[PDB]
């Protein structure tokens, strides 16, 4: 009951200590139907060159770590043919499978929350100011939450308790989420469908959802146990569609 | 007796599942020269999953779009003055002086509906050096005069007998007055635009004022009192219902100039940006 | 007594209401907020010969 | 009489209420209904009609027809990008004054797919192929054809049929997006690149132009009525 | 004709009777790591009696929760001044300036509905040394301008012709004006949050103002009068109906700062107490 | 479609005819010690005629008893001052400050319903030596803030963006604003009395304020104007509907003291008369 | 659009109206209903419950329990009247603060029969009999047992059952009487007298007391809602 | 015309009315409805979702994650109490800003059962057992494990399953309690004690923490809508 | 079209009305003024053993 | 005449009303206050494999 296998394209993930799988709102990803479309040209569907697991770079979970976030898309814009299909079209559409891995021994302890937040609009550390995109995202590198109130210009207000959105961090369980409790499991898996108020959208302009990893119980260990404990993310697009082919944009 | 009436809910189309293709069907190739708009969906150009869509187009129907109250006129009148024409308010009926409702109505060429009319009346004291008096509640009269009826000359004119004209009497501190009006036009539908003249020699009056002719409104104080002067303001609100509209038009781009014409000052198509390729970067550390 | 009973606007994933008319004129009735018809082909496809959408538009 | 009790809300004027009221003209006989062509039943019927997009909205061209033309030419220009813009159908200057944009600015929420049609208006002897690409939010906009080819795209071949449709499908984490779009409900971008280039014989003009039309698909809808920010006055009688 | 419409009442679940147990079924042992919330009732952990519960969840449905009127804007305007821009009021339409309705709406990501709009207008006299005059009833005009229409420059501008814009005319002392608006957005649903930009280069305008674009409101006095100056205040009230909402969110904890952004100052999670065991004693002689 | 809905009329019991009697049945002898109230009618003690009674208990049902609007709050706010906290009004939501509605609600222990909310806003001129100016119509904003949201500090604070809070915008001279609210409580029914504490050590806060926690209301002028100062007053009206109540209580005898407690001053049971036999004589020539 | 005409009553706030209004919280999900004991559906269910009547409301006793007791004793006291009062269930000081009285003061009109229950609270060895009489309007109140015996009366014998019910039947020329009763809608009076006297053995207290309860019958009803005169404030926050 | 008579309540603005009103945009055609995931139909669906409770709300920790952790350790600590708080789901600082609390603060009355889930977040080699107890109102809070064991309780054994649920059942004399709880509608208290203690081998951290989640059962409901006291402004544009 | 028709409140010794629901939430509907049920025995006769009223209460 | 008759909100332990629509647009109708559906499993049980609640969650 704890072993699982997931195959997509030419990639496969195995796990021996999984809890279950979260399907965001009971809805699996699927293609756009004819009585819900507005764009008229025939779309392209690569179907194995884009729908496969891509791995980002890892972060180091330390004894005093506030947490991390990524923005999707724009974290996969340099990933193979998914990124190339993003650069040549005006409209795109895709669901995702997210898989977070972190293993440790039976003498370690700690607890992480893994949550996906749709339309996570963030605020600036200067209240009479506006944010820029570098402070929101660094591609495949993670942004870091902070330990206290932040200051200075152009940075995002990132104290963990408010999640940078002006809410209580303990209520983020309203979104699709799982937990990694080091004594129970070593991986989390979330299946996210396409969620928007329009049927397709431009993938450079709009961040569809933010992935947050926040430790509630810090990492602890004793005399000569291993000190280096990394966390790794792996994401696979599903039912990917593109419309509006023209010359390649340049950021 | 009870009668059950059924209401059909209307939702948008579902998207169907679609797979790879290699054939001679070219749904994405068209020709706009025909005047035809392409009926292509995402499932004709990409691979899609099946989605059951439950969204409804209920708030974009014409009735829900137009059935709200909007201000169309505001006016002032006194209880005591030295002009005797500022003791009552009067105006000709139309919907062309407040730009919001009138731009909303001008999305169509012809319209037909009944109306619900509401009035909001407020009073205030005129700035004098000596204040202090108790005044009884004020009463106001509103009279509608269809074209051809006699016109009041003062606030004591015999014409406020209102024997055949419909009037409203109201006193302050109560709910706002309200009444409904049917579709009153000598034509089969109202006309928002008229590209014609009034005289057969192709001159005279041009445009909208040729066709409306729907009477006037007069408002006065009934007390005839107040050694210390007061001032009232009346506001009128329209709300159309049981609507039908024909021949849609492009929305007004330029700002309005007056209530009679469609006159305008040339305006741009939009505001500018840096270059035809400019992109705002928002993913930065 | 000339009562109309019809369904209320709800969501998807006790629900009806009652109306009586009080006045002699139909211009006194409340708005018709629950009629949802459409006919877009009048504006988007006003052509004499039918166009299939999988076939070429010309030739 | 019958005992009653008044609740909160009595004697108020709510501008979106729905009540009955007495008639000021009892038994008035209205003019019969005529069957005029072109009756409209829903505002979504207007938003499904194509209208021309002012893609070239740069300084010096805001009041000329040049605002509607996208320039292309022959020769080696593969490294140059043709056009690009954000997908904000009610917010961006590129889309806000079109039919679809004008309808959306009366509402707060929108949802559905969007159609962009491109028409080539060169000579009958010119040939070429283009790549039209849509990228989802999450990254910066592509800077080369290799990056853009990784998103949702189509390859347009110019020929006897003059028009090609790029359909932007609804890919979103929420059911609706804001008409006043922020970073949380962003929708992505669209870009165009030369797939091969333009080839012409002798005796033909070298430069050509492309035009773009926008409209809504059959799964599109809006909600939450509001007033529009495009019309205003400073006094009555206007 | 009469049509009978049936309404299904929806009550909460009854609790069933339960007795002692000694087995391998462990309903109280779970694992929150799965993202699943336990569906256990009191009858799984203690001994219970049978109760027939008649309570109904009727006042917590979305429609009954959101279908009330709330103030969204207030503004002032004069009849006489030396500025000519203070003779009329104007503003851009949204629901972000009054915190109560806007916090209530932001529990969800996307919303779709029709609206009922009401206006409440009041007037008053400006403080002058010499008072005393009788003023006739005041009339007010409200015009809605959709994006792209011409903008008034004064209170006598031609644009108040309101030929195609919808307007309301109203006079003080009557019921407040009211009208209904359908779901007007170029998208399939309204968006309360937008994590994106306006320009394809990931810069420009961030967040909510990119997507709304729903026009403006202009209000003026119609009388054009009053040698002694007066001042009016207008208040606007929204009421949504025929509602649908998607994707719930955690409620706003920090206080709002401005109408454009989600900017905030860091706030605590709650207030303190003495220690993790502190109990207030209330049974004392 | 039409659906016929039937309404059962409920009338009181008829009295039946009765004649002389001599038996062992003793309907008039009872015992109150049991806690039981005697169900005897006039036909059990005297001779009666047959009467068909058509009276109905329709106006004493709970819904008709409670479904009327009552004032629950009134407050003031200025357009210009030297305090910057008197430029807007704010208060915590409850129904305990006006004694009529609150005594009516306290006949029961628990209540559950939806609400209809109405606002009545008026303005006036502040007493100055120099009067005379024309002011444009005033606009007002009402914002509801649920617990945890950011709090405005001034009338120009960013928090009036009202991105997620619901707000109402209104202008004077229109109908009063109105909106409906569903049943919003974390419990299964509202609680009018709470004989308990907030801390587990039986101390802290006692009684009603432990359980309500339903947010705040903020109101301001939108114009930001008026060199001559004005003053507005806002009044709020509640009207419950779709009601259910439990556990009736004896009506309040003593006068209320404050809005937090049930504190009282000892009062008499009634007023006096001359003696236990006193009769007023009314048949005199 | 559709032609319409506004009638009188537009834009007013009537505090007892019944209209529809938009929701400020679309699609809010309410807490499920719980089946709590003791649900009330009509205010007449409360008025049918007995409550104690303060018959002894004389000077010096308005704040003690003595206000509820009617005194009786042994010996020759036949010429003395026990108690008497008018039938004004919402007006008289004797009835106005009871349950029935408190419910009636929210209304303007009432109709129906009224139950008075009397309980003897003496020792188990005391015996006696009383006469309870109701006189209709039209004359002055009786001054002796001989006069009182001519109206509607009952003879109560004290024994193992402790309680006796006097039912006042609805005898009126109009269908309803005013809660604020005047001379036109008067209803009569009630009086009590010794039928034989109280007899006790040695070793028992001589004085005893009687208590009286009031409630409404199953033909009772009220109408014309109004505000009550028993609650008031001089400023907000009370 | 037809004779009519106006009743009280005419021309008033009640903010919770429900009437019909004329449309300002006749025959507007709305955008079609899209099937967005995650549609909400009742506010009680949100209150049935678990959220984390800030049990450790003491001075110096109100803005750190330490506010969510309950500390436990190994050794002889049986006489020490683990945690305790009152049951006031909308009033107590411990519960007022959670999902359930935030929903309840829009209402005046609540009713139903409440679920508390506890999760142990120590090493895989630590063992222990705890006692979780709920006491009804009427007495002071227990001061020892012997007192607490007399109420409604459960014994939690830490093992391969990490979570244990304590269900608080609705035990009340009234059908509803106030959200603004007073002494009359009090609901009791919850306390935790060591049943055996924590045992660990060598090489493991000694201290561990516990977390607590709150949610509502399927018999829960609320009523009597009101405004919330958590949001406020001092001027417009906020 | 989802119309409800029900009887009006009249006297004793043409009479029905029509209602349509316009909004999606049931909290927007008008009040339920025509439901008249009663159950007084809950408060006036809350005893375990039944009392006949022609029989003595005790013995 | 297109009348809808539906039941009123009452208690538990003559009751219907009538409605007529007066306007041509459905956005003019009154609110839908009498629709009470629920689907909580969308937010509380969004897992791929079903969990029985009497069985262990793991193993």
What is the secondary structure of F127-187 as a DSSP string?
--SS---EEPPEEEEEEEE-TTS----STT-GGGG-SSBBEEEEETTSPPPEEEE----SS
Query: Tokens standing for H97?
Result: 């800003």
Please judge whether A107 and H68 are an interchain contact, meaning their C-beta atoms are less than 8 angstroms apart: no
Is E34 in Cβ contact with J34 (below 8 Å)?
Answer: no
d(CA E168, CA A54): 59
List the single best residue of A26, A118, A175 to mutate versus J (max J Cβ within 10 A): A26
Contact J51 E34 (CB under 8 A): yes
Give E-chain residues touching A185 at CB under 8 angstroms: 33
Between vectors from CA F58 to CA F56 and to CA F60, what angle results, nearest 5°?
115
CB contact under 8 A, J6 and C2: no
Token pair 């599942």 is found at B17
CB contact under 8 Å between G1 and H218, yes or no, is no
In the structure encoding, which two tokens stand for residue B120, read together? 């909001």
**Distance in angstroms (rounded) separating the CA atoms of residues D230 and G98:** 65
What CA–CA distance (Å, rounded) separates A76 from F26?
A: 92
Which residue, chain included where needed, has tokens 């004896």? F250
Place of tokens 């107490």: E273
Write the DSSP symbol of residue F57. Answer: -
Q: Which residues contact G234 (CB under 8 A, 6 or more apart)?
A: none
Shortest distance between the Cα of A36 and any Cα of chain H, in A, equals: 7
How many Å apart are CA G16 and CA F65, to the nearest integer?
Answer: 11
- Tell me how the structure was determined: cryo-EM
Q: Pick the closest to residue B245 from H132, E195, E166, E179 (CA basis).
A: E166
Q: Which of F98, F39, F111, F76 is nearest to F219 (CA)?
A: F76
Instruction: Measure Cα distances from E268 to A159, A160, E271, H94 in Å.
Output: 11, 11, 7, 13
CA-based nearest residue to A83, from D85, D151, D188, D168: D151
Please tell me whether residue A78 adopts helix, strand or coil conformation. Answer: coil
Helix locations, chain E, DSSP H: 62-66, 99-105
d(CA F31, CA I59): 11
Residues in CB range of D3: below 8 A, 6 or more apart: F59, F60, F64, G107, G108, G109, G222, G223, G224, G225
Tokens encoding D143: 């800077």
Q: Do J30 and H48 touch (CB under 8 A)?
A: no
Q: How far is I21 from chain D (nearest CA, A)?
A: 10
Distance from CA of I46 to the nearest CA of D (A): 30
The helix (run of H) or strand (run of E) holding residue D45 is helix D44-47
Residue F230's DSSP bridge partners are F125
Rounded Cα–Cα distance for residues D79 and D84 (Å): 14
Sequence-separated (6 or more) residues with CB below 8 Å from residue A16: A2, A3
Helix, strand, or coil here: F66? helix
- For chain C, positions 1-59, list CB contacts with chain H under 8 A: 10-13, 23-24, 29-31, 33, 38
J26 secondary structure, DSSP code: B
CB contact under 8 A, A122 and E195: yes
Closest Cβ–Cβ partner in A193, A216, A221 for H65: A216
Q: Does C9 touch chain B (CB under 8 A)?
A: yes
The radius of gyration of chain E's CA atoms, rounded to the nearest angstrom, is 28
Q: Would you tell me how many other CB atoms lie within 10 Å of the CB of residue F18?
A: 16
The whole-angstrom separation of Cα G27 and Cα G7 is: 34
Residue with tokens 């635009």: B193
| CA atoms of F79 and A196, how far apart (whole Å) | 42
Q: Which of J11, J15, J33 sits opposite F7 (nearest CB)?
A: J15
Q: Do H19 and C30 touch (CB under 8 A)?
A: yes
Judged on CB neighbours under 10 Å (0-12, 13-18, 19+), G85 is buried
Concatenating the DSSP letter of every residue in H214-229 gives: EEE-TT-EEEEE---S
CA distance A166 to A169: 9
Written as six digits, the tokens of F58 are 């329709």
Closest CA to G89 of G150, G47, G135, G49: G47
Select the residue from C11, C17, C23, C28 to test the I interface by mutation, using most I Cβ atoms within 10 A: C17
Q: Distance between CA D115 and CA D169 in Å, rounded? A: 9
CA distance E176 to D172: 41
- Pick from A24, A107, A181: CB nearest H125: A107
Chain discontinuities in chain C, listed by preceding residue (C to N exceeding 2.5 Å):
13
The chains found to touch C (3+ Cβ pairs under 8 angstroms) are B, D, E, F, G, H, I, J
Bridge partners, D72 (sequence order): D208
Chains that touch A (3 or more CB pairs under 8 A): B, D, E, F, H, J
- Closest in D88, D183, D225 to E195, CB measured: D183
CB–CB of J31 and G23 under 8 A? yes
Task: For residue C14, list chain J residues with Cβ-Cβ distance below 8 A.
Answer: 7, 34-36
What DSSP character marks residue J25?
Answer: S
Cβ neighbours for F95, distance < 8 A, ≥ 6 positions apart: F72, F101, F102, F105, F238, H108, H226
Cβ-based contacts of A15 with chain J (< 8 Å) = none
Residues in chain G closer than 8 A to D15 (CB atoms): none
Interface test with E, best of A124, A205, A216, A217 (most E CBs within 10 A): A205
Hey, what's the torsion of the CAs at H69, H70, H75, H77, to 10 degrees? Answer: 160
What's this structure's resolution in Å? Answer: 2.6
Rounded to a whole number of angstroms, the distance from the CA of B8 to the nearest CA of chain I is 7
Domains of chain A by residue range: 1-251
Instruction: Cite the DSSP H helix spans in I1-59.
Output: 41-44
Closest CB to G5: pick one of D14, D19, D24. Answer: D24
Calculate how close chain I gets to E43, using CA atoms only, in Å: 27
Nearest chain F Cα distance for residue D174, angstroms: 16
Task: Name the residue in chain G with its Cα closest to that of H6.
Answer: G9
Length reported for chain I: 59
DSSP characters for H147-172? HHTTSEEEEEE-SSS-EEEEEE----
């Amino acid at each position: 009951d704890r072993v699982r296998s997931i195959t997509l394209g030419n990639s496969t993930i195995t796990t021996q200590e999984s809890a279950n799988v979260v399907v965001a709102y009971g809805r699996w990803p699927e293609y756009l139907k004819d009585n819900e479309a507005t764009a008229e040209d025939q779309p392209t569907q690569p179907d194995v060159a884009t729908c496969r697991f891509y791995t980002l770079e890892s972060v180091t979970w330390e004894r005093d770590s506030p947490g991390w976030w990524w923005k999707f898309p724009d974290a996969l814009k340099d990933m193979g043919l998914f990124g190339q299909n993003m650069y040549y079209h005006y409209l795109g559409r895709a669901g995702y499978t997210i898989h977070v891995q972190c293993n440790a021994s039976k003498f370690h302890q700690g607890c992480l929350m893994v949550v996906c937040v749709p339309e996570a609009e963030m605020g600036c550390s200067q209240v009479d100011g506006t944010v820029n995109e570098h402070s929101l995202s660094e591609g495949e590198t993670a942004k870091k939450f902070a330990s206290t109130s932040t200051n200075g210009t152009n940075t995002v207000q990132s104290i963990v308790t408010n999640a940078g959105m002006g809410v209580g961090v303990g209520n983020l369980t309203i979104f699709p989420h799982q937990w990694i409790n080091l004594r129970t499991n070593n991986c989390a898996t979330i299946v996210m469908p396409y969620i928007n108020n329009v049927p397709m959208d431009n993938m450079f302009r709009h961040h569809n959802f933010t992935l947050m990893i926040i430790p509630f119980v810090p990492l602890d260990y004793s005399s000569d146990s291993s000190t280096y404990v990394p966390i790794t993310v792996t994401v696979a697009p599903m039912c990917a569609e593109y419309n509006g082919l023209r010359l390649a944009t340049s950021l | 007796v009870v009668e059950a009436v059924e209401n059909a809910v209307a939702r948008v189309a579902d998207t169907i599942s679609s797979g790879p293709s290699n054939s001679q069907a070219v749904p994405a190739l068209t020709a706009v020269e025909t005047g035809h708009t392409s009926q292509v969906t995402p499932s004709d150009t990409i691979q899609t999953r099946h989605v059951r869509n439950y969204h409804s187009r209920s708030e974009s129907s014409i009735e829900n779009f137009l059935c709200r109250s909007a201000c169309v006129y505001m006016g002032e009148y006194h209880t005591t003055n030295t002009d005797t024409s500022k003791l009552f308010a009067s105006w000709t009926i139309n919907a062309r002086r407040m730009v919001q409702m009138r731009r909303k109505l001008e999305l169509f060429t012809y319209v037909r509906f009944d109306m619900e009319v509401t009035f909001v009346i407020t009073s205030k004291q005129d700035q004098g050096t000596q204040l202090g008096q108790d005044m009884p509640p004020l009463t106001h009269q509103i009279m509608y005069i269809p074209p051809g009826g006699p016109i009041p000359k003062s606030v004591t004119d015999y014409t406020w007998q209102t024997s055949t004209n419909p009037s409203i009497f109201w006193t302050e501190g109560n709910a706002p007055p309200r009444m409904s009006i049917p579709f009153i036009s000598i034509g089969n539908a109202y006309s928002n635009f008229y590209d014609g003249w009034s005289h057969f020699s192709q001159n005279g009056v041009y445009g909208y004022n040729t066709l409306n002719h729907m009477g006037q409104i007069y408002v006065r104080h009934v007390n005839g009192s107040s050694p210390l002067p007061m001032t009232s303001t009346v506001r009128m609100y329209f709300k159309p219902k049981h609507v039908k509209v024909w021949v849609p038009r492009p929305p007004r781009l330029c700002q309005y100039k007056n209530a009679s014409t469609v006159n305008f000052t040339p305006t741009n198509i939009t505001e500018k940006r840096q270059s035809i390729n400019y992109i705002p970067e928002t993913v930065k550390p | 007594m000339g009562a109309q009973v019809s369904t209320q606007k709800t969501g998807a994933h006790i629900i009806h209401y009652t109306n009586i008319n009080y006045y002699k004129d139909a211009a006194s009735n409340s708005a018709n907020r629950q009629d949802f018809s459409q006919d877009p082909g009048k504006f988007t496809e006003p052509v004499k010969d039918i166009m299939v959408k999988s076939l070429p538009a010309l030739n | 009489g019958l005992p009653v009790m008044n609740t909160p809300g009595s004697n108020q004027f709510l501008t979106s209420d729905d009540f009955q009221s007495p008639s000021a003209m009892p038994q008035f006989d209205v003019t019969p209904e005529l069957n005029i062509p072109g009756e409209v039943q829903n505002l979504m019927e207007i938003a499904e009609v194509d209208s021309v997009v002012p893609v070239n909205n740069v300084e010096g061209k805001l009041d000329t027809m040049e605002i509607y033309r996208i320039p292309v030419q022959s020769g080696n220009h593969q490294s140059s990008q043709v056009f690009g813009f954000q997908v904000q159908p009610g917010l961006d200057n590129v889309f806000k004054h079109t039919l679809l944009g004008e309808i959306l600015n009366y509402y707060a929420h929108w949802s559905g797919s969007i159609k962009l049609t491109f028409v080539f208006c060169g000579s009958a002897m010119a040939t070429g192929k283009f790549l039209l690409a849509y990228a989802p939010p999450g990254a910066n906009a592509p800077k080369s054809r290799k990056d853009a080819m990784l998103g949702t795209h189509i390859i347009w071949d110019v020929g006897l049929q003059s028009s090609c449709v790029l359909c932007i499908p609804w890919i979103s984490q929420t059911h609706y997006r804001l008409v006043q779009q922020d970073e949380y409900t962003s929708a992505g971008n669209v870009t165009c690149w030369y797939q091969t280039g333009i080839v012409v014989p002798a005796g033909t003009p070298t430069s050509c132009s492309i035009m773009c039309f926008v409209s809504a698909c059959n799964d599109f809808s809006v909600r939450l009525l509001k007033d529009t920010p495009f019309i205003e006055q400073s006094a009555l009688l206007q």
